[PDB]
Amino acid sequence: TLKSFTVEKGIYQTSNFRVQPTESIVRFPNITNLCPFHEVFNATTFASVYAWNRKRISNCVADYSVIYNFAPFFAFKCYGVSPTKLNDLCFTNVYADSFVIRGNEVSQIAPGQTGNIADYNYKLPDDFTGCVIAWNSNKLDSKPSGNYNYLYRLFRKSKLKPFERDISTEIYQAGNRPCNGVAGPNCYSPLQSYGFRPTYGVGHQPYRVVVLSFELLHAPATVCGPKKSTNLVKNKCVNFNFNGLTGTGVLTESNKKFLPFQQFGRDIADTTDAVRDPQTLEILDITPCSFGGVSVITPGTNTSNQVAVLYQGVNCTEVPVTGSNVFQTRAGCLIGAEYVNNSYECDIPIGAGICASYQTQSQSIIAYT
Amino acid sequence: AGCLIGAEYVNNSYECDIPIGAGICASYQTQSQSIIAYT
Amino acid sequence: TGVLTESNKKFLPFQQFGRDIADTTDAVRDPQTLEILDITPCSFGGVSV
Amino acid sequence: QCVNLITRTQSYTNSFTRGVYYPDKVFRSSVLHSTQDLFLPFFSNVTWFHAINPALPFNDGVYFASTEKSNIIRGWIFGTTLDSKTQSLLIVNNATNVVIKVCEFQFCNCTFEYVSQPFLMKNLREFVFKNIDGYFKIYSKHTPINLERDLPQGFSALEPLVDLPIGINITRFQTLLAAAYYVGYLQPRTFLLKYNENGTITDAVDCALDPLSETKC
Amino acid sequence: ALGKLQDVVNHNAQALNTLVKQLSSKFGAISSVLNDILSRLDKVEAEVQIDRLITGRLQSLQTYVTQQLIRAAEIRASANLAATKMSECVLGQSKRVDF
Amino acid sequence: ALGKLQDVVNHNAQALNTLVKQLSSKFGAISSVLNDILSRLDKVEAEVQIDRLITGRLQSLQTYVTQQLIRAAEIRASANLAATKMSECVLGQSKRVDF
Amino acid sequence: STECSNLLLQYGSFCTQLKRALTGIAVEQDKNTQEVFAQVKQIYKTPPIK
Amino acid sequence: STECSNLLLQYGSFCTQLKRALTGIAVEQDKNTQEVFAQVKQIYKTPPIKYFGGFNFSQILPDPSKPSKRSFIEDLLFNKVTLADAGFIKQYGDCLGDI
Amino acid sequence: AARDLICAQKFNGLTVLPPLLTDEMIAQYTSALLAGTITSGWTFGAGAA
């Protein structure tokens, strides 16, 4: 710590001590159903971008590694998460939205993006946490005469809020002349059909898009993956994993009066203080494992190699293990220095009126007032 | 120091209770309970 | 955002903007008519209770 | 179908620091927490409606209140246009379940259905309806009211019952049916909430009411 | 009458409470919880968010240490004045006016 | 003769001038004007530049406040000396040599 | 700018403690002037005969 | 967190100099207290007779009944300043209580 | 036409607070001290003049 080979007389603050965890505990909800991701990615027809479906996925075990076998896509474009870690962490509700767009409009399916599709057909929130999947469908959603079954909206009196749908087809009024159900010179139909032909370029080819939206953790968790659970231990320093909330600490029964809609508890520094077990409805505190500071009391290296250790702020009942002498101090507790009834001038200050010195008793480190 | 709204000025001089600005202080007094400003 | 005021700043005919010490615009030229306008910030201040 | 609406008699009263809900599902104890959300402002102007009903606006969230011991009030209707054209919520209580439907009921295609547990049983019934990001949240609280006329003095935090993923547009609302109710409108406000040692919200401060509360915030 | 020592206690409490409350900030990251960042993202993106949190907490702790140094200098000047007053008022008789 | 009070004026004047002049720096962003950043880029691509400007201006404000605290400590020491000279040289007669 | 204010909210309490430090300096200046000059308790004035 | 420590190791010696500054402040506080109060070479004590020409000194001389030999005025000054315990006697042991 | 830097300081968040004691009050304090030490000596500092 001093980056030197000679140490002078005094007390020096070395590295801290920690108590290491014993085992790891995983706690996941008692859920055995399987999520129907196959019927989302394998359908005969997808809906248009103005009438996109929204499938609710809940109360099942989700395996996200089978999505790659279901559809031929390059990447798995996620915002707020990663495609690798989706099998470990878990949510409350999952939402799947499937539609068909053009190739130029795939970049508009993104948070904070505007355009035609983003303003009139499908808007994503700025705080979006979820994964967008897009793959080419020129072999299934195209015809040599031109596929006309996919439509999109061009005209609207305002923009669209995130996650809204527009179904009604009223004639747009672009001028001061009223339409009254007549598509005149200043009136146009708001829906226009996609033109999908196999001879078009790759930027105009149809693309099938599935967007998965995740609700992180506010409700009791219903969509959690295939990670197995472990029995709950208490009054021991262990690793814990509560519905994707990982950590290290000591769990114990609590007197916290949780209201029935509350599943977490936080501290002033925004860390989890109490948790509810997802299998049995009980409240557990989370206390970090025992720690403190370690100080080294020494004379000069040219004098002796003997040493005393002060564990500051730590009762020696909590100290696991270093000499044969143990003394209790208000500044911590002392190991390796014996206590005498005499009083001297202060040589090495420890604290709270306690000093230490090195002298003949042959020679040893003593502590005194 | 600017514009003071809610305290009415008096033509008296006491010790400073709440400092405001360039020689002006404010206080809370009995003679109805009210907030006054003074030099 | 600000208040536009008709100015007496002697803009050269090749100059379209006027800028400040703190890298902010003080005067602007109207694109449609050849007029120079001062841009001042709106009325602000501090409130003590 | 008929009409049978019995006019609408309006009056105005004061909110009296009412309409506070839990902003999240996180337990907090012995801490002052600042939250920016859609809150009913303190000492606001709320409207009292009597019926011994044209379309009311939905202005960024609705605080609803009822002091009806006789138990005639039973439901709410949401949406934009009450017909078989535009999507509209249909919260009806049958004293056992809450049926929630989006398309139409003709008021004597479909995307969502729901069923629930009974909401209800000298009492005050408070409700907060909120529509953010394709969701629809309902907060509620019952209170053993005394001093029958007007809203009481004090605090009562509104615990959430249901969060409903509807995903449609709301601009107008109606009420199912002597019958008197209070309507107020939420505003984007910053509040300073006080949690006691048991985790219950006891006091609050509205930071934009007066300079003293801004100083407190 | 004892407002100076009470201010000494209150400043030392308030700096530590500010340092504890500063840990809830995000500093531009996705979350202020470090394990949530490590659970949600893979290695490179979590390293980016971890670097943002590290820089923010390092700046906060440096600000705390600088304010502690300035306050320690002020307290040392006051202690030098108190030692001079112990030497001259108590151990002797002073002819200095208003000392 | 009155160089110290002129220096007291000039230090605060040049500190405020430097604090105003520090708003012209880009701090690695594409522009020093915030409205041009918001007008040129979309939200995701402009939040990085806004964060860079925020960090640079925050660091300049930290530097100004730290320098003001150090100068305030020096002025407090000089004011304590002036108060002692008011109490001893003016309100009495001093036997201290060259005080 | 509203977006800059929303991004500045994520940095915690730097702007409050800077304000606290400057407020302490501003109070200390008035304390310095009052400690130097306001030593007398009464406003003595000279007689007209000089 | 091991990953946070591994990325924190690349920022250099900021932690060591912050620790050095805090240790210097902590030693300087004890130096201040020693140079103010420890100005006498021998622990003098008053004779058991308590007549000093009619002067009393009962309120500033210590009371031997209390376990801490403080005077009445010293006990008043200790009671009035609401000084926190500041985690001296096993603060982790106090934090282990299920409260 | 000659732009003042104090306006650019004020427009960018930097304000200057006035002192509590004006120059007239400081001059009155100085006059009281000087009149006391002329007409009484050092007696006004230890008590009554």
Ligand SMILES: *[C@@H]1O[C@H](CO)[C@@H](O[C@@H]2O[C@H](CO)[C@@H](O)[C@H](O)[C@H]2NC(C)=O)[C@H](O)[C@H]1NC(C)=O
């Ligand atoms: C010196 O002061 C002490 C404390 O003020 C005096 O002790 C008190 O004396 C009165 C009556 O003279 C008693 O009623 C009290 O009970 C005494 N104790 C206290 C704690 O007040 C003492 O009398 C004084 N000495 C002389 C010589 O008068």
Ligand SMILES: *[C@@H]1O[C@H](CO)[C@@H](O)[C@H](O)[C@H]1NC(C)=O
């Ligand atoms: C899952 O396990 C927990 C813990 O034993 C139990 O309380 C719960 O009833 C179980 N759920 C089911 C559906 O069996």
Ligand SMILES: *[C@@H]1O[C@H](CO)[C@@H](O)[C@H](O)[C@H]1NC(C)=O
């Ligand atoms: C979809 O399911 C059918 C039968 O259920 C199967 O034959 C087909 O290979 C699947 N995939 C696609 C892309 O159609």
Ligand SMILES: *[C@@H]1O[C@H](CO)[C@@H](O)[C@H](O)[C@H]1NC(C)=O
């Ligand atoms: C240390 O541990 C003992 C035994 O658990 C306990 O009685 C005591 O209160 C603790 N603290 C101190 C300061 O001795």
Ligand SMILES: *[C@@H]1O[C@H](CO)[C@@H](O)[C@H](O)[C@H]1NC(C)=O
């Ligand atoms: C609410 O507004 C109406 C509008 O005229 C007014 O008469 C009434 O006094 C207001 N209520 C208050 C201020 O409590």
Ligand SMILES: *[C@@H]1O[C@H](CO)[C@@H](O)[C@H](O)[C@H]1NC(C)=O
């Ligand atoms: C949806 O609600 C918003 C309210 O801001 C309104 O402006 C818009 O016209 C509504 N759209 C439809 C289709 O009702």
Ligand SMILES: *[C@@H]1O[C@H](CO)[C@@H](O)[C@H](O)[C@H]1NC(C)=O
């Ligand atoms: C908290 O709850 C306990 C037990 O329910 C009660 O005794 C105490 O008064 C409560 N504290 C409050 C309401 O502040």
